[PDB]
A paper describes a structure:
The reaction center (RC) and light-harvesting complex 1 (LH1) form a RC–LH1 core supercomplex that is vital for the primary reactions of photosynthesis in purple phototrophic bacteria. The RC–LH1 supercomplex comprises an RC surrounded by the LH1 ring that is made of multiple αβ-heterodimers. LH1 collects photons directly from sunlight or from the peripheral antenna, light-harvesting complex 2 (LH2), and transfers excitation energy to the RC. In contrast, some Rhodobacter species, such as Rba. sphaeroides, possess dimeric RC–LH1 core structures, representing the largest photosynthetic complex in anoxygenic phototrophs.
Wild-type (WT) Rba. sphaeroides DSM 158 contains both RC–LH1 monomers and dimers, corroborated by atomic force microscopy (AFM) imaging of isolated photosynthetic membranes. The cryo-EM structure of the RC–LH1 monomer (33 polypeptides, 76 cofactors) at 2.79 Å resolution shows that the RC is surrounded by an open LH1 ring of 14 αβ-subunits, with a large gap (46 Å) formed by a PufX TM polypeptide that has a tilted angle to the membrane plane. The RC comprises the H, L, and M subunits, a bacteriochlorophyll (BChl) a dimer as the special pair to act as the primary electron donor, two BChl a monomers, two bacteriopheophytins (BPhes), one spheroidene (SPO) carotenoid, and a Fe2+ ion, similar to the reported crystal structure. The monomeric RC–LH1 structure resembles the architecture of the RC–LH1–PufX monomer from Rba. veldkampii, except for a missing LH1 subunit and additional densities (assigned as PufY, see details below) that are located between the RC and LH1, on the opposite side of PufX near the LH1 opening. The structures of the monomers within the RC–LH1 dimers of both classes and the WT RC–LH1 monomer are closely comparable. In contrast, the N-terminal domain of PufX (Ala2-Pro15) is not resolved in the structures of the monomer and Class-2 dimer, presumably due to its disordered structure when not binding with RC-H and LH1-1 subunits of the neighboring monomer. Moreover, a putative UQ-10 (QY) that associates with PufY and is close to the RC QB site was identified in the cryo-EM maps of the Class-2 dimer and WT monomer, whereas it was not visible in the Class-1 dimer. The head group of QY is located near the cytoplasmic side and is sandwiched by the aromatic rings of RC-M Trp41 and PufY Phe7 via π–π interactions, forming a quinone-binding pocket. In addition, an extra UQ-10 molecule (QY) was identified in the Class-2 dimer and WT monomer at the gap region between PufY and the RC, suggesting that PufY might be involved in congregating quinones close to the QB site where quinones are photoreduced and protonated to quinols.
Numbering used by the authors:
A (entry chain H): 1 to 247
B (entry chain X): 16 to 67
C (entry chain L): 1 to 281
D (entry chain 0), K (entry chain 8): 6 to 49
E (entry chain Y): 3 to 52
F (entry chain M): 2 to 306
G (entry chain 9), H (entry chain A), L (entry chain D), M (entry chain F), N (entry chain I): 1 to 54
I (entry chain B): 5 to 49
Write the structure that this text describes.
């Protein structure tokens, strides 16, 4: 087949390369269409549908069957924010930021945003809660690191905010997820473990100042935390980085 | 307002000084690599031009 | 314009240079100070590439090439049509890359996420700067860099490799290749596993991370986890690029001969140097 | 009556007046420079 | 402040270089120094003192 | 300051035996030891491993392949442990000489033992592919891993089985050595002109660099949004949270377009299977259709001519 | 022609002025580099030839 | 062709104006670069040859 | 009916189109004068 | 230049001053390297 | 009065006065440096 | 043939119009490039040879 | 054969029309490129030879 | 032999139709390229030799 061309310089290599270009165009189209299953249709900044929607048409719906009788999820589907957003326009023209009306960490906007996830705890493959306090978890213990229980907690303002009392553990993955921190008023808050640095004699939280620890959203049941509570806590703690820069 | 003049000058100097510090730091890095290449025995063993 | 959830995240803050100035969007893109810088540098580089194509006399995009100055110029300026355009485009490309990284930092701190992505990008920028700045500066000329052409920078790769015999005898090269192959394998396995859990047999419920853990524990006897697999992917990619940069920086600066000859230090170890058998005996 | 930016009719008219002033100043400078270059070294 | 792990790594690096030069002189080859120094440095760094 | 690269506290509980969807539990083993180093980076638990019939087949054939190559290396060393350690990476099983073609009449020292080892390796790899398919099926999952592995197998088969048959000689195949198969790739590029000018070589390299790029991007993104529990992606698919939203908005404000928590994995799997698939095509084309890739590039507008 | 002021009814002056500055500076630099690339109109080399600096 | 104004009920004028500005600039640069690539229309070289500039 | 995607009524669309056509014709006239100048200078047919 | 001052009711003066300092310095550096890369005007060479 | 910045008309006028002062001083310094370079080595 | 208008019930006009514009521009550019690639229809070379522009 | 309309109860008419348009245009381009690559049936070269334009 | 219709109760018609169309088009294109590769059946060369278009 060496040198055997159908026409011009077109041989099996040229046939293969053009076939691959057509396949690659089709595959990119498929991949983008599959990407388009969340956040669409596009909106105007006043909430209405946008005149311009994009070159790629919206894919056909597909359905997930959630485990443990949690239901089904059809995407793309009718998605609403379902929460009030305390933001104000700074310009009539589009493309400009929206300014917080009040306290952005309290209101949950910007880097302090949270999503209205399900108000149920996340489950493992057996139906039990995925995340449990280490006292509830039977047979769990701290293995090979600096044990944080009892260490003082220090905010970004060089002041003590409380002490670590428990560790919340992801039972299936066998990893630590949250630090339970008791404040001065005898109330416990949860801090994401990705947001604290465990030092030799303290736990440092750079995102949050000592006073702001009081405003962390709490959990309604001491023995478990739901997905909505995880979003609220993590959004608050992460937004502390931008909205607690002074002090 | 003289304070206004000095404030304009201070902001201009801040921008220019940050840019100059960055550019001179890069120039110093280039000089560092050049000198440490001088110390290397590159002069003895020289490679051919790879662009043809 | 906006995603269904995008509105609450567009807030006025997190810039590095400037304030409300440049704190706006152009369509989907965020354009800060470094957005303006990135656009300027990228447009300048692209127009200069087209003008170099005009100068060279070709309009075929696969034949367009922008060559570095010849070795007779050393580390000084060159005429525009004889290496100056390459230098200007290199400065523009460096500026575009660094401004892109800084723009990503601004987006990271507007969204409240960590700066892992700009750090990972900086690794690639350092590999590019090794190939285009550090190695030519140590070697003494801009002509040891590679040309800006689709098929001529491959000629640079071929000539540079074959100067030192067969190039995959360079040890750091071996490490970099191993990391690249392992990374592609890990990416395929990871994507396939996540998709298979999210897309089970028809009519089944979605699988859980326990099912993924069980699948790889059944297959190979070990599961690294979700956090583990993402850490592994980041580190595999960065280690590949780091070791490629190393193997190139030591190539014309410390080593000068065939690398297959470098591997003779192991053979000539005193306690088996002269044993009469095998391949080297 | 159509509005995308929040500018009134008079506000846009004044903005355009000063923008035209700047454009004509810039263009006059450009013409003087081009005349100088052409006298120095013509390109036609 | 510096961490105990960080101190172990600094001292492991200096011990690696030291023992490497040490056993590259003792043995006839630099590979002996590399092997002995790397083994000692790995053992030192894998056992933080806290 | 914590970058979530290494765990700072490590916890252990009872070992997890796994799911029981329809797996034959008699074919599993016990849990192995826990490892603290792996715990620092990822999971500490080792095992339990499934070993059924396809596992026995794969283990036997792969063990025989490894043993055949090792015994040949010992023969080359002269049964000397010192020479075996010294000239390791220099030994090789070579395929038959070009005079023998595809025939199975080559002697054991020349190319017959290479054929025996190749049969063992073929059986081992195909049984391992069957094992991946059946392990996905037992748990009720999709077979994405099986088809990605099939892409990799396609490149392996082209290199060792399909192209030698089209070329009509076993000598076209790869030797079993460390430096020897590297020399094989170099000689392959030299004999066929310049493999840089194979366009499917270029596509394969594009997709290898793309795998590195994409999976640095994706690992960095998941690590960046893991403060919101982003690494638990299977439930971010079912219940979109602030982590997935922030990731999508980062990439949309950066490069104009984004993905989902599942579409990015589709991108990933395709970006890797494409490197191996295009590589297989490009290798199959070399020698059978194009004997000189630089001249092909000159005729196809890629080289100045 | 007399109705062109209504362009500011569509486009906010901030983004427009940013883009226009970027575009104008880019075009000026482009034209200067194009002129410097040609043997003629490379005013530095023209001066060097005229005053025999070499 | 008297009802063409209804295109503005289909497409937003601001998107259209931005896209067409980019298109027109790029088209102009393309045609100019093509003319500069042609030796018989490269006005710089034409002027250099006309006035005996080397 | 209106068949509107952008929220523009008929009158706003007409006024916008009239001004746009004014601009297009001015741009086209400048292009025509440029082409006349070039064609007198160096005809391409 | 009758009403150019109204540009300061469009842009923040502090940020404009900082960005303009950056621009002026980078323009000066560009012109200086253009001059240096030429055989003539290279004052360091002479 | 669009006023995207918070400065009034008079504040803008005063600040523009000082900015013009600086722009002309910078222009004078650049002009004298150019004259020096042109005397030392003309580029025309 | 008189029912072709119903195509607008099948297809969204916005995407049809955008795709049609892109396709028409790319087809025109492709045909122009083909003509410029052939020595017998490159009108710039044809003018360069009719008028003695060496 | 008179009951072929039922294909539209099997296939989505909008997907079919897009796939068919892409297919038809690609086939037409491919045939034209084949004819251009054969020295006979390359209409531009045939006209050039006929009118002695070389 | 008269019950082959029962194949449509184990195969979904959409999958069969799409696969059949893709397979048929690919087979036909492959056979055409094979014939064009063989000089005996390259009809564009046979016609050129018949009417002396060389
Ligand atoms: C005109 C020429 C151009 C041609 C094309 C042009 C046409 C227009 C463009 C068309 C492009 C469309 C691209 C979109 C595809 C994306 C589909 C997708 O991902 O999801 C849908 C679907 C499943 O989606 P899902 O939602 O995840 O399902 C979940 C299920 O519930 C539960 O899961 P499941 O059990 O159902 O299975 C899950 C899996 C399932 O999908 C599959 O079943 C794939 C089947 C394996 C691939 C087929 C080849 C195997 C050999 C044939 C023997 C087996 C055939 C029967 C397969 C059993 C199916 C019942 O889905 C995946 O996502 C796997 C992704 C990775 C697949 C990689 C396969 C590579 C194998 C390498 C083969 C190499 C040998 C030959 C190489 C080429 C020869 C030159 O997956 C597919 O359909 C995969 C399509 C496989 C494509 C094969 C590759 C073509 C290669 C051609 C290269 C170009 C030619 C140039 C060279 C020419 C030389 C002359
Ligand atoms: C990395 C070590 C070597 C090198 C070795 C090789 C080899 C070997 C090959 C390539 C190939 C490619 N290289 Mg190279 N390449 C180098 C440096 C570069 C740089 C750079 C600024 O540093 C760039 C932009 C490129 C660009 C490219 C593409 C033309 C192509 C596919 C890359 C790809 O998809 O990557 C992954 C990235 C993505 C998938 C994202 C999208 C990126 C797109 C595709 C880039 C287009 C750039 C465009 C042509 C130019 C700018 C405008 N190379 C250095 C000198 N490169 C392959 C090829 O086909 O060449 C013809 C090939 O065979
Ligand atoms: C002088 C050398 C030549 C050259 C010669 C070749 C040749 C020859 C080939 C490549 C191939 C490839 N080359 Mg090249 N290559 C050159 C220069 C480059 C450069 C560069 C910057 O210069 C780059 C980046 C590349 C990159 C690439 C890759 C994209 C590609 C290999 C994919 C892969 O993963 O294979 C590795 C993966 C596999 C082989 C698949 C393995 C799958 C099987 C199933 C595994 C079985 C394992 C066994 C059971 C293991 C037991 C293990 C134990 C259980 C632990 N080449 C130059 C021009 N290159 C290949 C290709 O496809 O080209 C088109 C190829 O064959
Ligand atoms: C270190 C681990 C991997 C790594 C990592 C990451 N990579 C990232 C990120 C991370 C984490 C990002 O966050 C960032 C991004 O947003 O991604 C979407 C980025 C990006 N990785 C690009 C290309 C890329 N990554 C490569 C390699 C790896 N990446 C390695 C393997 C390779 C090759 C050759 O392998 C290529 C080609 C762009 C797509 C994009 C920058 C866009 C830009 O900067 O735009 C700004 C610039 C332009 C739009 C054009 C400027 C043109 C100049 C002036 C003219 C240049 C001409 C050129 C020299 C000609 C050559 C011929
Ligand atoms: C997308 C393209 C990528 C990719 C893809 C995939 N690769 C897969 C899968 C996918 C998806 C699997 O599902 C499967 C697997 O289980 O993964 C855990 C597999 C595997 N890829 C292996 C090797 C490998 N992949 C390479 C490359 C890439 N692969 C490219 C980049 C390279 C090189 C050279 O780079 C090598 C060496 C084995 C580890 C393993 C098979 C073991 C075997 O066959 O055992 C059978 C053989 C034995 C048991 C012999 C044992 C001998 C003694 C005991 C020792
Ligand atoms: C070629 C195809 C062009 C595709 C671009 C499409 C633009 C759509 C878009 O995203 O709008 C952005 C944004 C989007 O507008 P928006 O944010 O106000 O609202 C979008 C519209 N709805 C309501 C439907 C959502 O527009 C702007 O940012 C305006 C900035 C000022 C632009 C003034 C006109 C500039 C025209 C170009 C002149 C410069 C040419 C330079 C050429 C390139 C130089 C290298
Ligand atoms: C960017 C790449 C994605 C482009 C996809 C555009 C698209 O789907 O068309 C939808 C638009 C209609 O937009 P739509 O909003 O009604 O979406 C239609 C949904 N599907 C895809 C299922 C049909 O269709 C058309 O543009 C008309 C297509 C008919 C004739 C096709 C000729 C194509 C010529 C190909 C040139 C190569
Ligand atoms: C390769 O191709 C080559 C280079 C050879 C040739 C190809 C060339 C091209 C394509 C050239 C492009 C030529 C163009 C298209 C030039 C555009 C020129 C323009 C449009 C210039 C705009 C000048 C406007 C200027 C400076 C702005 C004057 C504005 C002002 C000072 C600011 C206004 C002040 C204000 C508004 C206050 C407003 C606030 C209130 C409260 C009223
Ligand atoms: C390689 O091939 C070559 C290049 C050789 C040849 C191939 C060539 C091609 C493919 C050439 C393409 C030529 C084209 C397609 C040109 C398009 C020209 C157009 C269509 C230009 C549009 C000009 C429109 C202009 C300037 C707009 C004037 C608009 C205005 C100011 C906007 C005013 C409208 C307004 C303001 C809104 C105000 C009203 C209210 C109610 C607010
Ligand atoms: C003390 O140490 C002992 C002795 C205990 C064991 C130590 C052992 C060693 C040192 C083992 C060496 C293992 C090595 C160095 C293996 C090299 C493996 C490599 C690197 C292979 C590289 C490329 C191989 C490729 C593509 C193979 C493709 C093979 C194929 C498709 C299989 C083809 C199957 C077929 C040819 C022949 C058909 C005949 C029949 C009867 C089906
Ligand atoms: C490749 O291109 C080459 C290099 C060949 C040439 C191309 C060149 C271009 C296109 C260059 C662009 C030049 C431009 C456009 C320059 C803009 C210069 C400006 C607008 C400068 C304004 C400077 C304003 C200054 C200093 C004022 C700052 C004001 C102050 C500090 C306040 C004054 C306080 C005071 C005076 C009392 C003093 C004690
Ligand atoms: Fe992931």
């Amino acid at each position: 087949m060496v040198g055997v061309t159908a026409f011009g310089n077109f041989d099996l290599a040229s046939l293969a390369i053009y076939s691959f270009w057509i396949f690659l165009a089709g595959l990119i189209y498929y991949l983008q269409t599959e990407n388009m299953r969340e956040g669409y249709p596009l909106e105007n900044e006043d909430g209405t549908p946008a005149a311009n929607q994009g070159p790629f048409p919206l894919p056909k719906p597909k359905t997930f069957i959630l485990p443990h009788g949690r239901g089904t999820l059809t995407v793309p589907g009718p998605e609403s924010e379902d929460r009030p957003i305390a933001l104000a326009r700074t310009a009539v023209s589009e493309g400009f930021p929206h300014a917080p009306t009040g306290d952005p960490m309290k209101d949950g906007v910007g880097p302090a945003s949270w999503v209205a996830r399900r108000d149920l705890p996340e489950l493992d493959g057996h139906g039990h809660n995925k995340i449990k306090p280490m006292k509830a978890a039977a047979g769990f213990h701290v293995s090979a690191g600096k044990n944080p229980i009892g260490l003082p907690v220090r905010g970004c303002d060089l002041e003590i905010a409380g002490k670590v009392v428990d560790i919340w553990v992801d039972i299936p993955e066998q990893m630590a997820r949250f630090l339970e921190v008791e404040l001065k008023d005898g109330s416990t808050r949860l801090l994401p473990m990705q947001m604290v640095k465990v030092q030799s004699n303290r736990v440092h939280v750079n995102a949050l100042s000592s006073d702001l620890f009081a405003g962390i959203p709490t959990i309604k049941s001491p023995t478990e935390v739901t997905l909505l509570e995880e979003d609220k806590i993590c959004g608050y703690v992460a937004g502390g980085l931008m909205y607690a820069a002074p002090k | 307002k003289t304070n206004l003049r000095l404030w304009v000058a201070f902001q201009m100097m801040k921008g220019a000084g940050w840019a100059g510090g960055v550019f001179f730091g890069t120039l110093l890095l280039i000089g560092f690599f050049r000198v440490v290449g001088r110390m290397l025995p590159i002069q003895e063993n020289q490679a051919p031009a790879p662009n043809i | 314009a906006l995603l269904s959830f995008e509105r609450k995240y567009r807030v006025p803050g997190g810039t590095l240079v400037g304030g409300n100035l440049f704190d706006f969007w152009v369509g989907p893109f965020y354009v800060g100070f470094f957005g303006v810088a990135t656009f300027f540098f990228a447009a300048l580089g692209i127009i200069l590439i087209a003008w170099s194509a005009v100068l060279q006399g070709t309009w075929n995009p696969q034949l367009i090439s922008v060559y570095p100055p010849a070795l007779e110029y050393g580390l000084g300026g060159a005429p525009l049509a004889k290496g100056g355009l390459w230098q200007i485009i290199t400065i523009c490309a460096t500026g575009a890359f660094v401004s892109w990284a800084l723009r990503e930092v601004e987006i990271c701190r507007k969204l409240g996420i960590g700066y892992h992505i700009p750090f990972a990008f900086a690794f690639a920028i350092l590999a590019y700067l090794t190939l285009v700045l550090f190695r030519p500066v140590m070697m003494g000329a801009w002509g040891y860099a590679f040309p800006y052409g689709i098929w001529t920078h491959l000629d640079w790769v071929s000539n540079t490799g074959y100067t030192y015999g067969n190039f995959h005898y360079n040890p750091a090269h071996m490490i970099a290749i191993s990391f690249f192959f392992t990374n592609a394998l890990a990416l395929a396995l990871h994507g396939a596993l996540v998709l298979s859990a999210a897309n089970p047999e028809k009519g089944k419920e979605m699988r859980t991370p326990d099912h993924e853990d069980t699948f790889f524990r059944d297959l190979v006897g070990y599961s690294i986890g979700t956090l583990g697999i993402h850490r592994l992917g980041l580190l595999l990619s960065l280690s590949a690029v780091f070791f490629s940069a190393l193997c190139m920086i030591i190539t014309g600066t410390i080593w000068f001969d065939q690398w297959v000859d470098w591997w003779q230090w192991w053979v000539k170890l005193p306690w088996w140097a002269n044993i009469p058998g095998g391949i080297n005996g | 009556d159509l509005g995308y930016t929040g500018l009134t009719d008079e506000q846009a008219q004044e903005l355009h007046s000063v923008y035209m002033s700047g454009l004509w100043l810039f263009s006059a400078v450009a013409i003087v420079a081009h005349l100088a270059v052409y006298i120095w070294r013509p390109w036609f | 402040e510096v961490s105990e792990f960080a101190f172990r790594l600094m001292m492991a690096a200096v011990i690696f270089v030291g023992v490497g030069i040490m056993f590259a002189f003792a043995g006839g080859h630099w590979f002996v120094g590399l092997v002995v120094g790397g083994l000692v440095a790995a053992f030192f760094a894998a056992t933080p003192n806290s | 300051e914590y970058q979530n690269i290494f765990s700072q506290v490590q916890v252990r509980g009872p070992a997890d035996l796994g799911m029981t969807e329809d797996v034959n539990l008699a074919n599993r083993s016990g849990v192995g030891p826990f490892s603290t180093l792996l715990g620092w980076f990822g999971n500490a638990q080792l095992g339990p491993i499934y070993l059924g019939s396809l596992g026995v087949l794969s283990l036997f054939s792969g063990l025989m392949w490894f043993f055949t190559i090792g015994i040949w290396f010992w023969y080359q060393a002269g049964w000397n442990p010192a020479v075996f350690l010294r000239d390791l990476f220099f030994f090789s099983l070579e395929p038959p000489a070009p005079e023998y073609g595809l025939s199975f009449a080559a002697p054991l020292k020349e190319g017959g033992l290479w054929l025996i080892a190749s049969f063992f390796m073929f059986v081992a790899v195909w049984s391992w592919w069957g094992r991946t398919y059946l392990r996905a099926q037992a748990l009720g999952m999709g077979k994405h891993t099986a088809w990605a592995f099939l892409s990799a197998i396609w490149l392996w088969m082209v290199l060792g089985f399909i192209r030698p048959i089209l070329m009509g000689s076993w000598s076209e195949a790869v030797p079993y050595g460390i430096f020897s198969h590297l020399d094989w790739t170099n000689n392959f590029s030299l004999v066929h002109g310049n493999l840089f000018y194979n366009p499917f070589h270029g596509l394969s390299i594009a997709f290898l660099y793309g795998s590195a790029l994409l999976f640095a991007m994706h690992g960095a993104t998941i690590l960046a949004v893991s403060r919101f529990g982003g690494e638990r992606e299977l439930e971010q698919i079912a219940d979109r949270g602030t982590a997935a939203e922030r990731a999508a908005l980062f990439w949309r404000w950066t490069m104009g377009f984004n993905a989902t928590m599942e579409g990015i994995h589709r991108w990933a799997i395709w970006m890797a299977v494409l490197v191996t698939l295009t590589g297989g095509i490009g290798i199959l084309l070399s020698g059978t259709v194009v004997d000189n890739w630089y001249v092909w590039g000159q005729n196809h507008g890629m080289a100045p001519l | 022609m007399s109705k062109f002021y209504k362009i500011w009814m569509i486009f906010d002056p901030r983004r427009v002025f940013v883009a226009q500055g970027v575009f104008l500076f880019l075009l000026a630099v482009m034209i200067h580099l194009i002129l410097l690339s040609t043997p003629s109109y490379n005013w530095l080399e023209i001066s060097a030839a005229k005053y025999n600096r070499v």
